[PDB]
């Protein structure tokens, strides 16, 4: 069926019911309405069509004033086809943004209201206010400030030659080729093109790489930019365009406790919606927590028999006073199914903060909607690392009913900083012992470190992490003394701050200190760790935290950061335990970023179409052969709604890249289990390349591949930072939704298997793509890249490496794909040389000792640089345990990276064992081929 029957509610109570086309825009639907209303009661009372706006109930169950009438009804997606005419009344701006926020984040803003939660209401009020302020503040400043927000510089982390450049102006056919050196500042290069005849000043201008939103400006040389550097190595002329400051403004213009010494205790009233074996009996094990370690011993209930609605009415008393509870104290419950014990199944769990978001010790009834216990290796009693947020499936999910007893007549808070700092104030063999414990390159050691805690501050400031762990958080005296030191502790480097963000350090003062040290991060370096910081939010107790404030600050100062923060958050909105937290951050992000909100809408619509286009192809693959399915895919793409939605959008993978015109003939899908779509684009305003693609994946989880690709990109940066380009291909990868995302298409490449299937075909393939003088370059590209991907794969523990999942570019550059497994999970993955790669490295000779020794140096140098930054990888990997990746879940998985980089060993000890593992790979290269 093409047309839909639509219900119209006119403002005089009148009701029309007639068919319209799905692809018809709202403006057209209104003309058809008014033409029909004519011949119905009370028409003379209506104002003209332009006086009213249509209104519907959208897919997220909210009313939406449909202000854009050049918008198809199929793209509106009303719940039922019901359109109500209402007045073009009140503030259109606030009603429009709220509606778009709901459709963008995949969660209706009314769902936040419906909770009736003060914490949520206080977050929304403060963050939306702060974000609007920053955005209003953003709009006042000039075109310099705005271009840096919008299109921040893409720079490389050293010869001085010269080559020509194609320069022109905006809205002009004629172009100017002329010389310029590699070490010229872009202020000077503009003046050269400004000398057209012999009118205008070049300080009222900026250079733009045409066909992309990348801009060349600021006090930096031409060679340090990504475009110019990429152009120099390949051997092509930089195509740029001059743009006036007025043209940039055209883009811009849019708009008390310590007295209470009674033991802590809780009343366990009832359970609800429990589903279990009727033979057994139910138990509720419980314990108090601060981070990983316990505050006291774990209590337990009596064995009430199994039913849906088990009742206990027990007093549970814990060995700790109410005065001794730290700010981040954490009551953790686990419902267990035990046998009668006449001669163990964890059902579910739930955690709760004893204090609330305004520091008030909680009192009265609480209904803790439990999450079910997934069974794992270290089968612990309780789940203290789990979220404190309640299960949002309140209708069906299990529940425990508890009641915190009243402690006093007036409500008791946690002491403020001043009263904490009040009680906080109050040669040697000890100096040698303390150095031995900390200078590493247990309860006896803990009590030593505690005694000399002030000497740790003076002499071992980087050891704070160790000191916070040795502190006894079940005594408010010790807590008071530790915080006192932290308040005057020297600023630690970023590397140490990253460690302090781990779940072991839950206290609000530690996070605050951590984030204080993270404010020195540049946008480039911050971007390198963005994935890890987002995942740390899952360890947060409360909604309003310093990390959320920090990530929002950085997201509003830099449009690239905001973009990737958005998608990192948006891609997990389907996950119940963070939908709320992430939902609110995204709302706050949008209100301060209403311009980028438009770009993100255009992408989200594209990604909604592709899902549908994939789901069709998935079913159409099982029905028919591929060439017909390929044609049936194109017909669905040719449709006006589809074609426009997939066309003219910024790439989610890289917002500076412009996906203009879909080349429908070039489009197809790759042969795989989930049948991912190969969507190709072209941009006639762009440079010499001017052809980009994206692989739309839906069915498989891509978080593994992104993490892996993130960490290789970090290696490449670390190597490039030390003057070592290993010619790596850090292709984009971005999760966008539920088991959904995008991969960047690397053109001019294939898998080694399909090069070999079509004497040695690997060196022949490179010969056909790089004839003559080009071949000697192409082998060096291969050698450098083979080195880097050999070291990367080894260090990360990536097995399963074969010809079907390694690819090679026509330039010679080798690279890997489909990183399903890592850290040796599925035993140490050995270092791997292949005969085929060594064959090509040596230029097709038996012995090329000169060339192969350069390669051994590249592997050896690469491996040495990563060891220097080994704590960086451990810290980053430690925070990714929050993500719940199957293969990154425990200390053993982190221990793998420690051993693979030989961090326990000395530097030269590491080199000797690496060479041994190198040599054995050269030995095993011959045996594998036979």
């Amino acid at each position: 069926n093409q047309s839909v029957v639509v219900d119209f509610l006119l403002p005089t109570g009148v009701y029309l019911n007639f068919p319209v086309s799905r692809n018809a825009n709202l403006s057209t639907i209104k003309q058809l309405l008014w033409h029909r209303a004519q011949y119905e009661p009370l028409f003379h009372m209506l104002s003209g069509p332009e006086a009213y706006v249509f209104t519907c109930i959208n897919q997220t169950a909210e009313q939406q004033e449909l202000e854009d009438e050049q918008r198809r009804l199929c793209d509106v997606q009303p719940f039922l086809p019901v359109l109500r005419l209402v007045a073009r009344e009140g503030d259109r701006v606030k009603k429009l943004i709220n509606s778009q926020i709901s459709l963008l984040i995949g969660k209706g803003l009314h769902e936040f209201d419906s909770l009736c939660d003060p914490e949520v209401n206080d977050f929304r009020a403060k963050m939306c206010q702060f974000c609007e302020e920053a955005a209003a503040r953003r709009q006042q400043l000039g075109w310099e400030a705005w271009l840096q927000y919008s299109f921040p510089l893409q720079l490389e982390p050293l010869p001085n030659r010269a080559l020509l450049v194609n320069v022109k102006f905006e809205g002009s056919e004629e172009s100017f080729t002329f010389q310029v050196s590699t070490k010229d500042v872009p202020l000077a290069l503009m003046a050269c093109a400004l000398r057209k005849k012999a009118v205008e000043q070049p300080e009222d201008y900026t250079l733009q790489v045409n066909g992309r939103h990348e801009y060349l400006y600021g006090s930096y040389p031409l060679c340090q930019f990504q475009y110019i550097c990429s152009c120099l190595h390949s051997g092509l002329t930089p195509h740029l365009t001059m743009v006036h400051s007025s043209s940039i403004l055209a883009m811009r213009d849019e708009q008390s406790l310590w007295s209470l010494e009674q033991p802590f205790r809780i009343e366990l009233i009832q359970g609800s919606k429990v589903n279990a074996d009727e033979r057994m009996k139910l138990v509720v094990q419980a314990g108090l927590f601060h981070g990983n370690e316990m505050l006291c011993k774990t209590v337990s209930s009596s064995e009430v028999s199994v039913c849906s609605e088990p009742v206990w009415k027990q007093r549970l008393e814990f060995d700790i006073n109410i005065c001794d509870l730290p700010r981040m104290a954490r009551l953790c419950f686990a419902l267990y199914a035990v046998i009668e014990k006449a001669k163990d199944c964890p059902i579910a769990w739930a955690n709760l903060m004893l204090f609330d978001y305004k520091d008030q010790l909680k009192t009265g009834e609480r209904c803790l909607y439990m999450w079910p216990s997934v069974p794992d290796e270290k089968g612990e009693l309780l789940n203290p690392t789990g979220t404190v947020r309640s299960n949002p499936n309140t209708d069906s999910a299990a529940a425990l009913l508890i009641c915190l007893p009243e402690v006093a007549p007036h409500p008791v808070y946690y002491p403020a900083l001043e009263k904490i700092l009040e009680l906080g104030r109050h040669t040697e063999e000890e100096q040698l012992q303390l150095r031995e414990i900390l200078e590493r390159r247990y309860e006896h050691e803990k009590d030593l470190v505690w005694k000399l805690r002030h000497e740790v501050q003076e002499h071992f400031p980087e050891a704070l992490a160790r000191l916070l762990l040795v502190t006894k958080w079940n005594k408010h005296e010790d807590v008071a003394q530790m915080l006192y030191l932290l308040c005057s502790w020297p600023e630690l480097p970023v590397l140490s701050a990253l460690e302090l963000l781990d779940f072991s350090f839950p206290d609000c003062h530690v996070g605050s200190f951590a984030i204080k040290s993270l404010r020195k991060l540049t946008d480039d370096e911050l971007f390198q760790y963005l994935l890890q910081l987002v995942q740390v939010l899952k360890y947060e107790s409360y909604l309003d935290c310093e990390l959320t404030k920090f990530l929002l600050d950085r997201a509003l100062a830099n449009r690239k950061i905001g973009h990737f923060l958005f998608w990192h958050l948006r891609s997990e909105m389907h996950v119940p335990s963070v939908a709320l937290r992430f939902g609110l951050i995204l709302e706050a992000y949008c209100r301060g970023s209403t311009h980028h909100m438009k770009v993100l809408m255009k992408q989200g619509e594209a990604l909604s179409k592709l899902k549908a286009l994939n789901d069709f192809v998935k079913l159409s693959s099982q029905k028919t052969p591929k060439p017909q399915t390929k044609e049936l895919m194109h017909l669905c793409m040719r449709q006006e709604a589809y074609l426009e939605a997939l066309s003219h959008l910024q790439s989610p993978l890289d917002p500076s890249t412009l996906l203009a015109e879909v080349c429908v003939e070039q489009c197809t899908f790759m042969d795989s289990k989930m049948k991912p779509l190969w969507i190709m684009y072209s941009n006639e305003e762009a440079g010499s390349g001017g052809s980009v693609g994206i692989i739309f994946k839906n069915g498989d989880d891509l978080r593994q591949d992104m993490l892996t690709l993130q960490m290789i990109q970090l290696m490449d940066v670390l190597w490039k930072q030390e003057g070592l380009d290993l010619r790596m291909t850090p292709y984009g990868c971005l999760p966008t939704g539920d088991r959904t995302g995008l991969i960047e298409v690397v053109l001019r490449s294939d898998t080694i298997a399909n090069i070999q299937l079509n004497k040695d075909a690997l060196l022949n393939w490179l010969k056909s793509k790089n004839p003559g003088e080009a071949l000697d370059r192409a082998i060096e590209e291969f050698t450098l890249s083979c080195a880097g991907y050999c070291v990367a794969t080894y260090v990360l523990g990536i097995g399963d490496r074969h010809s079907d999942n390694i690819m090679i570019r026509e330039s010679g550059q080798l690279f890997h794909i489909d990183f399903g497994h890592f850290l040796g999970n599925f035993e140490r993955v050995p270092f791997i040389l292949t005969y085929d790669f060594v064959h090509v490295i040596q230029q097709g000779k038996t012995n090329n000792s000169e060339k192969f020794e350069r390669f051994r140096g590249y592997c050896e140098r690469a491996y040495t640089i990563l060891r220097r930054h080994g704590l960086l990888f451990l810290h980053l990997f430690a925070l990714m345990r929050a993500a719940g990746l199957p293969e990154l879940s425990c200390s053993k998985d982190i221990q793998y990276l420690k051993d693979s980089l030989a961090l326990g060993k000395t530097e030269e000890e590491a080199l000797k064992h690496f060479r041994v593992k190198f040599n054995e790979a050269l030995r095993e290269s011959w045996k594998t081929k036979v």
Partner: protein, 170 residues
């Protein structure tokens, strides 16, 4: 003067046979749980989607109930004004249109009811899924701890990693 062991067989090849069996029994029960955990999560997403669709019906009906309210208030002035004009035609057109409006509200209410019935069913499935999950957990934990106890027994006895891997890996 210390006891602990819970392993059944006595010979190294006999214990290694039971290592292969219990491991195979473990990996099958894990696949059973994972299959059930997919349903749990899928049903959790489906039920939530049904609950927001019910909120959508409510908000839709709520808009129809306002249209009813407005029709009653707004007609009052014109039904009298056209009756003094002797125009029972213009009155009769208004009321049938209002009868048509009310007939549509009964269609939308019936559809809301059908979804409420389906949400009632899928809430029951969710609970049964959760019950079967919780009935499989004790076996899954049993089979893991046995598997490990046999691994340690053979590792203490000196059995090499290659003999262990061929019992496990297959």
């Amino acid at each position: 003067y210390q006891q602990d062991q819970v392993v059944k067989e006595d010979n190294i090849e006999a214990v290694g046979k039971k290592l292969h069996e219990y491991n195979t029994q473990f990996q099958e029960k894990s696949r059973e749980y994972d299959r059930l955990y997919e349903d749990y999560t899928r049903t959790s997403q489906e039920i939530q989607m049904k609950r927001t669709a019910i909120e959508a019906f409510n908000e839709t009906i709520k808009i129809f109930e306002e249209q009813c309210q407005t029709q009653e208030r707004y007609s009052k002035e014109y039904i009298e004004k056209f009756k003094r004009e002797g125009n029972e035609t213009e009155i009769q057109r208004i009321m049938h249109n209002y009868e048509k409006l009310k007939s549509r509200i009964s269609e939308i209410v019936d559809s809301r009811r059908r979804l409420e019935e389906d949400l009632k069913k899928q809430a029951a499935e969710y609970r049964e899924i959760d019950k079967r999950m919780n009935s499989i957990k004790p076996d899954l934990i049993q089979l893991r701890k046995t598997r490990d106890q046999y691994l340690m027994w053979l590792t203490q006895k000196g059995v090499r990693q290659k003999k262990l891997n061929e019992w496990l890996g297959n």
